[PDB]
PDB file of C-alpha atoms (C1' of nucleotides) in Angstrom:
ATOM      1  CA  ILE A   1      42.998 105.573 223.008  1.00 43.06           C
ATOM      2  CA  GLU A   2      40.513 105.945 225.935  1.00 39.78           C
ATOM      3  CA  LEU A   3      37.004 105.167 224.520  1.00 43.06           C
ATOM      4  CA  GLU A   4      34.264 107.072 225.540  1.00 44.09           C
ATOM      5  CA  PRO A   5      31.474 104.748 226.734  1.00 43.12           C
ATOM      6  CA  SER A   6      28.883 106.938 225.731  1.00 40.78           C
ATOM      7  CA  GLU A   7      30.024 107.042 222.273  1.00 43.26           C
ATOM      8  CA  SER A   8      29.800 104.116 219.763  1.00 44.07           C
ATOM      9  CA  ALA A   9      33.388 102.496 219.124  1.00 44.46           C
ATOM     10  CA  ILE A  10      32.141 101.918 215.468  1.00 43.82           C
ATOM     11  CA  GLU A  11      32.352 105.166 213.836  1.00 44.66           C
ATOM     12  CA  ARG A  12      35.640 105.992 215.280  1.00 42.71           C
ATOM     13  CA  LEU A  13      37.136 102.822 214.223  1.00 41.49           C
ATOM     14  CA  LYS A  14      35.746 102.426 210.583  1.00 44.87           C
ATOM     15  CA  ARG A  15      38.862 102.653 208.592  1.00 44.22           C
ATOM     16  CA  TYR A  16      41.234 100.887 211.111  1.00 40.83           C
ATOM     17  CA  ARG A  17      42.421  97.599 209.951  1.00 41.10           C
ATOM     18  CA  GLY A  18      43.594  94.868 212.401  1.00 41.59           C
ATOM     19  CA  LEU A  19      46.507  92.768 211.935  1.00 43.82           C
ATOM     20  CA  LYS A  20      48.378  89.710 213.718  1.00 44.63           C
ATOM     21  CA  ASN A  21      51.719  91.443 213.163  1.00 45.66           C
ATOM     22  CA  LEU A  22      52.668  94.626 211.316  1.00 48.52           C
ATOM     23  CA  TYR A  23      56.030  92.963 210.296  1.00 49.09           C
ATOM     24  CA  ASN A  24      54.560  89.919 208.904  1.00 48.20           C
ATOM     25  CA  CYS A  25      51.516  91.027 206.813  1.00 45.80           C
ATOM     26  CA  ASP A  26      51.269  92.814 203.433  1.00 46.38           C
ATOM     27  CA  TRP A  27      49.599  95.627 202.499  1.00 47.43           C
ATOM     28  CA  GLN A  28      48.949  96.733 198.867  1.00 45.09           C
ATOM     29  CA  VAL A  29      50.774 100.127 198.765  1.00 41.90           C
ATOM     30  CA  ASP A  30      48.093 102.647 198.598  1.00 44.85           C
ATOM     31  CA  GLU A  31      44.456 102.361 198.671  1.00 40.26           C
ATOM     32  CA  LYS A  32      40.993 104.315 197.848  1.00 41.30           C
ATOM     33  CA  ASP A  33      42.143 106.398 200.644  1.00 42.06           C
ATOM     34  CA  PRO A  34      40.542 109.607 200.401  1.00 42.22           C
ATOM     35  CA  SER A  35      42.593 111.038 203.355  1.00 41.03           C
ATOM     36  CA  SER A  36      45.593 110.800 200.921  1.00 38.74           C
ATOM     37  CA  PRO A  37      46.860 113.717 199.022  1.00 40.40           C
ATOM     38  CA  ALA A  38      45.451 113.593 195.532  1.00 44.27           C
ATOM     39  CA  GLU A  39      48.898 114.255 194.160  1.00 43.04           C
ATOM     40  CA  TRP A  40      49.951 110.927 195.209  1.00 43.21           C
ATOM     41  CA  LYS A  41      50.003 109.998 191.563  1.00 44.19           C
ATOM     42  CA  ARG A  42      51.777 113.185 190.972  1.00 44.38           C
ATOM     43  CA  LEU A  43      54.836 111.921 192.567  1.00 43.33           C
ATOM     44  CA  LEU A  44      58.000 110.600 191.182  1.00 48.57           C
ATOM     45  CA  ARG A  45      58.368 106.887 191.752  1.00 46.69           C
ATOM     46  CA  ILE A  46      61.973 105.697 192.435  1.00 45.84           C
ATOM     47  CA  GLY A  47      63.498 102.235 191.798  1.00 44.69           C
ATOM     48  CA  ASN A  48      66.839 101.695 193.738  1.00 47.01           C
ATOM     49  CA  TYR A  49      67.712 104.952 195.078  1.00 46.39           C
ATOM     50  CA  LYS A  50      71.380 104.007 194.756  1.00 45.86           C
ATOM     51  CA  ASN A  51      70.772 103.033 191.161  1.00 45.61           C
ATOM     52  CA  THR A  52      69.045 106.326 190.662  1.00 43.49           C
ATOM     53  CA  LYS A  53      71.825 108.730 192.228  1.00 44.44           C
ATOM     54  CA  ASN A  54      75.013 107.212 190.712  1.00 39.27           C
ATOM     55  CA  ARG A  55      73.349 107.387 187.335  1.00 38.36           C
ATOM     56  CA  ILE A  56      72.475 111.079 187.784  1.00 37.25           C
ATOM     57  CA  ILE A  57      75.913 111.917 189.116  1.00 34.77           C
ATOM     58  CA  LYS A  58      77.178 109.852 186.202  1.00 32.86           C
ATOM     59  CA  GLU A  59      75.405 111.926 183.668  1.00 30.36           C
ATOM     60  CA  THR A  60      76.256 115.030 185.583  1.00 33.47           C
ATOM     61  CA  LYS A  61      79.963 114.214 184.922  1.00 33.39           C
TER      62      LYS A  61
ATOM     63  C1'   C B   1      62.255  84.266 184.158  1.00 35.03           C
ATOM     64  C1'   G B   2      64.894  89.391 183.958  1.00 33.63           C
ATOM     65  C1'   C B   3      66.893  93.569 185.863  1.00 32.92           C
ATOM     66  C1'   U B   4      70.971  96.019 190.022  1.00 35.11           C
ATOM     67  C1'   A B   5      75.987  96.016 192.838  1.00 31.12           C
ATOM     68  C1'   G B   6      80.350  92.790 193.139  1.00 30.02           C
ATOM     69  C1'   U B   7      85.362  90.116 190.713  1.00 29.44           C
ATOM     70  C1'   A B   8      89.401  87.481 187.679  1.00 30.88           C
ATOM     71  C1'   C B   9      91.124  86.404 181.758  1.00 33.08           C
ATOM     72  C1'   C B  10      91.555  88.211 176.824  1.00 29.60           C
ATOM     73  C1'   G B  11      91.297  91.681 173.422  1.00 28.37           C
ATOM     74  C1'   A B  12      91.463  96.679 169.994  1.00 29.05           C
ATOM     75  C1'   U B  13      92.774 101.527 170.928  1.00 28.43           C
ATOM     76  C1'   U B  14      98.274 100.868 166.796  1.00 27.55           C
ATOM     77  C1'   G B  15      97.124 103.017 172.328  1.00 28.96           C
ATOM     78  C1'   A B  16     100.629 105.417 176.114  1.00 32.87           C
ATOM     79  C1'   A B  17     103.654 105.194 179.350  1.00 34.48           C
ATOM     80  C1'   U B  18     107.420 102.812 182.563  1.00 35.80           C
ATOM     81  C1'   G B  19     111.439  99.724 183.086  1.00 35.73           C
ATOM     82  C1'   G B  20     114.798  94.742 181.547  1.00 31.79           C
ATOM     83  C1'   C B  21     117.327  91.838 177.877  1.00 32.46           C
ATOM     84  C1'   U B  22     118.704  92.551 172.805  1.00 26.61           C
ATOM     85  C1'   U B  23     119.568  93.867 166.899  1.00 28.85           C
ATOM     86  C1'   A B  24     121.937  97.944 164.062  1.00 30.31           C
ATOM     87  C1'   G B  25     123.608 102.804 163.786  1.00 34.19           C
ATOM     88  C1'   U B  26     124.577 107.464 165.933  1.00 32.49           C
ATOM     89  C1'   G B  27     126.832 109.570 170.077  1.00 30.38           C
ATOM     90  C1'   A B  28     127.328 114.873 173.762  1.00 32.37           C
ATOM     91  C1'   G B  29     131.083 116.009 177.071  1.00 31.94           C
ATOM     92  C1'   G B  30     135.679 116.474 179.481  1.00 31.18           C
ATOM     93  C1'   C B  31     140.634 114.226 179.437  1.00 32.26           C
ATOM     94  C1'   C B  32     145.084 112.344 176.630  1.00 31.86           C
ATOM     95  C1'   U B  33     146.920 113.284 171.964  1.00 34.19           C
ATOM     96  C1'   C B  34     148.208 115.262 166.172  1.00 33.31           C
ATOM     97  C1'   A B  35     147.901 120.306 164.434  1.00 34.17           C
ATOM     98  C1'   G B  36     146.568 125.392 165.135  1.00 32.32           C
ATOM     99  C1'   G B  37     147.862 130.415 165.893  1.00 30.90           C
ATOM    100  C1'   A B  38     143.733 135.390 167.179  1.00 32.52           C
ATOM    101  C1'   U B  39     147.195 137.503 170.541  1.00 35.33           C
ATOM    102  C1'   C B  40     151.094 138.891 173.866  1.00 36.98           C
ATOM    103  C1'   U B  41     156.278 139.472 174.630  1.00 39.46           C
ATOM    104  C1'   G B  42     162.236 138.835 175.011  1.00 39.39           C
ATOM    105  C1'   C B  43     167.260 139.746 171.858  1.00 40.90           C
ATOM    106  C1'   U B  44     169.827 141.030 167.450  1.00 41.22           C
ATOM    107  C1'   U B  45     171.806 142.651 162.378  1.00 42.49           C
ATOM    108  C1'   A B  46     168.624 147.180 161.684  1.00 41.15           C
ATOM    109  C1'   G B  47     165.194 152.089 160.856  1.00 41.91           C
ATOM    110  C1'   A B  48     165.597 158.308 162.701  1.00 42.69           C
ATOM    111  C1'   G B  49     167.880 163.015 164.146  1.00 45.54           C
ATOM    112  C1'   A B  50     174.437 161.120 169.278  1.00 45.78           C
ATOM    113  C1'   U B  51     168.095 153.268 178.673  1.00 42.43           C
ATOM    114  C1'   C B  52     164.672 157.543 170.883  1.00 42.10           C
ATOM    115  C1'   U B  53     159.801 155.041 168.203  1.00 43.16           C
ATOM    116  C1'   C B  54     160.252 156.521 163.078  1.00 42.31           C
ATOM    117  C1'   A B  55     160.400 150.138 158.098  1.00 45.75           C
ATOM    118  C1'   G B  56     160.973 145.686 158.610  1.00 48.09           C
ATOM    119  C1'   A B  57     163.879 140.623 159.078  1.00 49.20           C
ATOM    120  C1'   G B  58     165.615 136.467 161.969  1.00 48.98           C
ATOM    121  C1'   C B  59     166.380 133.809 166.691  1.00 49.69           C
ATOM    122  C1'   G B  60     162.752 132.740 170.360  1.00 49.50           C
ATOM    123  C1'   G B  61     159.205 132.202 174.578  1.00 51.78           C
ATOM    124  C1'   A B  62     153.827 132.210 176.669  1.00 49.60           C
TER     125        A B  62
END
RNA sequence: CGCUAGUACCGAUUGAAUGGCUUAGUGAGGCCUCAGGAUCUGCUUAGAGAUCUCAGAGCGGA
């Protein structure tokens, strides 16, 4: 990103979070986001997807 | 700590199927035999009027 020096780089970068390394750190999964879809809780959560679909095909048989 | 994939022994389905051995009994089928005789057919006394059936009865053979 190429900052405009005229404008304050604080308001642009309010929501950003700095990290040592993406791979190493840990986020708690969501946040008080409010640019998420509010239907985030209106989503089916899945465990092991393998242990979902073989079960469902098993019930389909 | 617990839940999820993975691999071998029992064990029930009286399961339910494949073969091996084995008990006892049955055993088709040809073939060889003991009979059989549907039937078919020779010859002869012989039936009827001059290689003619008009009844049969023997002697046979397939």
